[PDB]
Paper text:
A major challenge for the utilization of [name] vectors in the clinic is the presence of pre-existing neutralizing antibodies (NAbs) in a large percentage of the human population. This study structurally characterizes the interactions of 21 human-derived neutralizing antibodies from three patients treated with the AAV9 vector, Zolgensma®, utilizing high-resolution cryo-electron microscopy. These complex structures provide unprecedented details of the mAbs binding interfaces, with many antibodies inducing structural perturbations of the capsid upon binding.
In each map, the capsid was well ordered, while the densities for the Fabs above the 2-fold axis could not be interpreted for model building. For the sixteen 2-fold binding Fabs, this strategy resulted in maps reconstructed to 2.54–3.56 Å resolution. The localized reconstructions with C2 symmetry relaxation confirmed that only a single Fab is bound at the 2-fold region. The epitopes for the sixteen 2-fold Fabs comprise VR-III to -VII, and -IX of the AAV9 capsid. Other frequently contacted residues are T491, T492, R533, D556, N562, N704, and Y705, which are clustered around the 2-fold symmetry axis.
Numbering used by the authors:
A (entry chain H): 20 to 139
B (entry chain L): 23 to 129
C (entry chain A): 219 to 736
D (entry chain B): 495 to 591
E (entry chain C): 543 to 639
F (entry chain C): 398 to 494
G (entry chain B): 349 to 397
H (entry chain C), I (entry chain F): 689 to 736
């Protein structure tokens, strides 16, 4: 029914910039708040950013402020995360999630894409 | 921001046992608390949301209670499928925060 | 009329004539351009559970509006004293509004230095919403009213409204309003504007306190001919049940039969101004009385009119049961308790239950040879036949009127923040600067023009209200309590300017000093 | 049939005004008793008159006349009964009504 | 309301038409929710603030509400019972009292 | 039978006319605003509410802090009117599971 | 003018006797004003009849 | 009568254009008149 | 004015109740007025 | 109706369940006219209008 | 008439009267060379 | 209009042009000044 797909994951050297795209086929995409959640290896998951269902507003976690830009295209039903000035800490599996109406929990999650920041 | 504290960090039990997980909040987050069950290589899956309420398609053995700053996740009649990592997350305010996590072990 | 002629004069004073008092206020205003002449959709920017109660959807408009809905707009402190010491009640009758001496200024900013000049051909648009067709924002205790002190120049607030919303989204039932779609009068610098308004009949505000209490209405010298049940047992032992009855009389005034009972209650949590007496936890929002509407929780504020505290305890106040005003210069967020003025409703204790107490007790079961009588506390009580109550008091800083919502039913429509409820209150007065475009391109373009001349206007407002008075008839022998100034020397005169020219209001002043028998 | 304890004042319905408690007497108009039960009366819900020559204090029940509001049972709730029941929760697959 | 041809007893949910009063959410509390919360005690250095749910709430000064809607299938008028008192006599199934 | 009535054979007819007593118009409209949203979304109130009862975590942190009610928090604003009365109903789902 | 405290609505004794042949004593008038415990307050009223 | 200054159009009660075996609020092939759904009175809006 | 004797209800032009980020025939957050769809004149019916 | 008779009627049930459903009354030979529903007076098109 | 006097007012609305509807629109224009 | 009526047509027309402002633009060194020109005219006619 509701499907979220994440693309653009890969390895990049530090200071590098990466863009992530989320595809949503299963619902009205413009009715929902969308989030980015990352889980570092061997760690609990962590909230990165969310963006308003029309894209008017957006919030980011303090660590990534200014280096990441969340964006939304309602016509293409796609969610984009723009990453700049990448760091070793930043490497994690990135999850695209949909926030539940009224409750605000993540009812639906994308499979996720692994993104690695390596010195090599 | 709000801090979420989950106890115990690790737990081991046997099939049929009753398991209880406790989540504490630094600030009042009302009823906006969710419990997520996660297995290796998969995304977290919501079990219980908004304090007490159970997600559709989830077994009735999972239960949740509490409000304000204290919440508890209860599993009755434990099953082999139940062993996983459990997270409590607060959706009350941004940045959304997750609990450290409780890992369940076979006995 | 003309550029070099004045279109109005300055009228400020009060005229006390018999049972009528007529107040007139004149102020100088400044009107900017809002939203760059645009209507804009607005909604809450927050997310999460916390946003739920705070969610909204609406529009901000280029228009401004005039708000005279506070009492210190119309009364000086001496006039308010003259009112509340001598009168049992008052109410508004007529309204007269003028807008004149309009000036439109253009601002040309070049290289960081700005020039201001007259634009003599520009207009300002004004209309009143006589048919109550716009959303009515004047009854929400907002800022932007005419300043209490006549020498202050004030900025006109921007108009905006909310419509139906689901979270931050709208629904098909939501309404949009273009204020350009009303007829409005256009004014150049020689033009002026006025209209008059007639208040619909409202009851007199009761500016008095009761010198009796609802439970003390009996003659203290005489017995009742009614009986009450004094004893259910003869004494200690087994099988001592009995029925004994006594006359209610001066000795026991609590058991007497009464014809009338105190009014309704919705309990508030009790907070102390001595902070060591309060609990060591955050309970402001969590421990607050609230009501829910369509899933959203609203604080009950100020709520039903209830006595602020019991006699002898003035350090306690209802958690969100009182009106709280800021002192002059008080910041916006997280100010201390000495920065605000907490009003109290102690005068209404005679007929109204205390805000922080239960209404009373009820029986929760049937007592029997096997079951003791059980009671429970009534935390909230709605209207009962035989209740009497007082409304909330009005203050010099407080609101005057509210618009009664248009609904199938209402009860005692008197507004809960105080003042006079009206189905047709004084109408909204909307004002904006007419946009003057800058030079368009020399080839045609179909897009709307986004380039304008930076411009603002200023002028004079006078408002005149006739008030009807209800004079005190009392036969009380001993002298009354009056509102008065204190003779002790101070560095400043209260209700005056300081050495920097800042006018302040030292304390909130209520209306209830004179007494009436219950 | 009554309990073996003193509950006249302690078990009485009351209202509070400025810290003082007043008995609710006679109170709102309610039917004195259910049909068929006339031996019961509201604790302080009825008007009670004395018979001629009745003393002032601690008189027996045959010395007074307890009136009843049995006529108004057609429209009014019984004084000694609950008004009714309300739902206190949301029933669900995990919760009974 | 029943659909045309619906039996008298124990019909399924697709045989009936359940109307809703969703329009009146703007002024009226939801039928299945509590009205709100009240304080149940006095908070103190030894006692935390406690609240309780208001399951039923009678008229308060300052309330506004809408009546029930009328339907094409529904009743038009009702007779107001002849009584000493009534409040907002508009009939509860809808229409004109 | 103890009322007077008109008797009709097949050629007779019967009629009468009736005058409704004054009733309010049924309100056949829905509100485009909600009772809790009546404020101007651009302006602050001049009223204050109690924002904080403690400075933070610890012992003896009691304090009184007050804030202005404004566009950011519309739930704590002072309002003149409140929603109408409620008597709670149990909630049933058309999804039977 | 209803300027005195009104004691007639408190179900008191001292009314005209139901039986016309009885001679009755007239009851004494008195009133209560605001009180804190047994003390008065500045808002309390005194009336000379 | 409705006096409103609302700019955008109202919600109205309307029939649905989609083809069906029966016209709503009509008889069927056996001559039975039915009422498809309950119809309330509240469509137009007013400011609160 | 429409005189019709039609028994069943007409098709009407109406707004849709479903929630949206914008009200149709209103301004958006930047102040731009738009017209969502073209609206014709033909809804009521007449016999041929 | 009722073969031209007035007849006394009451609930025929017994037990605790009957309590809420108990009644006493009369059925009459008379009929009555009831126009008290709206679809009596309005067609669906008129109700829309 | 004069520099400082307004030569017209803003009229926008519709009046529905019987079989007639009267619409009035007012706009602000800019004319180049 | 379209929900309640079988037809419509225009009858009368009334046109007004007012509150005329003539602005002059003096551009010097890339910065432009706008001022009122109070004696300038605008010409209008209808092609009756």
């Amino acid at each position: 029914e509701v499907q979220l797909v994440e693309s653009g994951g890969g390895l990049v050297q530090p200071g590098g910039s990466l863009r992530l795209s989320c595809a949503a086929s299963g619902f009205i995409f413009s009715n929902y708040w969308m989030s980015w959640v990352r889980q570092a290896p061997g760690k609990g998951p962590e909230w990165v950013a969310n963006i308003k269902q029309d894209g008017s507003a957006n919030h980011y976690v303090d660590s990534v402020k200014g280096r990441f830009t969340i964006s939304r295209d309602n016509a293409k039903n796609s969610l984009y995360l723009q990453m700049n000035s990448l760091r070793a800490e930043d490497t994690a599996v990135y999850y695209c999630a949909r926030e539940a109406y009224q409750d605000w929990n993540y009812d639906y999650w994308g499979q996720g894409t692994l993104v690695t920041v390596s010195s090599a | 921001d709000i801090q979420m504290t989950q106890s115990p960090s690790s737990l081991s039990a046997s099939v049929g046992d009753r398991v209880t997980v406790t989540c504490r909040a630094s600030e009042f987050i009302s009823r906006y608390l969710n419990w997520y069950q996660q297995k290796p290589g998969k995304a977290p899956k919501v079990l219980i949301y908004a304090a007490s309420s159970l997600q559709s398609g989830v077994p009735s053995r999972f239960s949740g209670s509490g409000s304000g700053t204290d919440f508890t996740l209860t599993i009755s009649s434990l099953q082999p499928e139940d062993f996983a990592t459990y997270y409590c997350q607060q959706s009350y305010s941004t940045p959304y925060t997750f609990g450290q996590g409780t890992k369940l072990e076979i006995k | 009329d003309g550029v070099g002629s004045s279109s109005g004069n300055w009228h400020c004073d009060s005229q006390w004539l018999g049972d009528r008092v007529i107040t007139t206020s004149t102020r100088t205003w400044a009107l900017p351009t809002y939203n760059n002449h645009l209507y804009k959709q607005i909604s809450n920017s927050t997310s999460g559970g916390s946003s739920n109660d705070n969610a909204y959807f609406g529009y901000s408009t280029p228009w401004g509006y005039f708000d005279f809905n506070r009492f210190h707009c119309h009364f000086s402190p001496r006039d308010w004293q003259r009112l509340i010491n001598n009168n049992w009640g008052f109410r508004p009758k007529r309204l007269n509004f003028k807008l004149f001496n309009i000036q439109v200024k253009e601002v040309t900013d070049n290289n960081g230095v700005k020039t201001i000049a007259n634009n003599l051909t520009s207009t300002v648009q004004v209309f009143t919403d006589s048919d109550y067709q716009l959303p009515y924002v004047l009854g929400s205790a907002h800022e932007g009213c005419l300043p209490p002190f006549p020498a202050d120049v004030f900025m006109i607030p921007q108009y905006g409204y909310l419509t139906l919303n689901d979270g931050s989204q709208a629904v098909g039932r939501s309404s949009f309003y273009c204020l350009e779609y009303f007829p409005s009068q256009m004014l150049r610098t020689g033009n002026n504007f006025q209209f008059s308004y007639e208040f619909e009949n409202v009851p007199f505000h009761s500016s008095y306190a009761h010198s009796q209490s609802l439970d003390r209405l009996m003659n203290p010298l005489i017995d009742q001919y009614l009986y009450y049940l004094s004893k259910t047992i003869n004494g200690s032992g087994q099988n001592q049940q009995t029925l004994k009855f006594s006359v209610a009389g001066p000795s026991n005034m609590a058991v007497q039969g009464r014809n009338y009972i105190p009014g309704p209650s919705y309990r508030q949590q009790r907070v102390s101004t001595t902070v060591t007496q309060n609990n060591n936890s955050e309970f402001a929002w969590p421990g607050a009385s609230s009501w829910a509407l369509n899933g959203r929780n609203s604080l009950m504020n100020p709520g039903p009119a209830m006595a602020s505290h019991k006699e002898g305890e003035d350090r306690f106040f209802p958690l969100s049961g009182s009106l709280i005003f800021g002192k002059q210069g008080t910041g916006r967020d997280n100010v201390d308790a000495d920065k605000v003025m907490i009003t109290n409703e102690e005068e209404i204790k005679t007929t109204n239950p205390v805000a922080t107490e239960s209404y009373g007790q009820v029986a929760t079961n049937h007592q029997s040879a096997q079951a003791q009588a059980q009671t429970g506390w009534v935390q909230n009580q709605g209207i009962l036949p035989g209740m009497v109550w007082q409304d909330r008091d009005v203050y010099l800083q407080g609101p005057i009127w509210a618009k009664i919502p248009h609904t199938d039913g209402n009860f005692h429509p008197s507004p809960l923040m105080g003042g006079f409820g009206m189905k047709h209150p004084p109408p909204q007065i909307l004002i904006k600067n007419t946009p003057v475009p800058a030079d368009p391109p020399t080839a045609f373009n179909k897009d709307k023009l986004n380039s304008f001349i930076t411009q603002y206007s200023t002028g004079q407002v006078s408002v005149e209200i006739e008030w009807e008075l209800q004079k005190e008839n009392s036969k009380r022998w001993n002298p009354e309590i009056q509102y008065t100034s204190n003779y002790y020397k101070s560095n400043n005169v209260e209700f005056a300017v300081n050495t920097e020219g800042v006018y302040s209001e030292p304390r909130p002043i209520g209306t209830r000093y004179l007494t009436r028998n219950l």
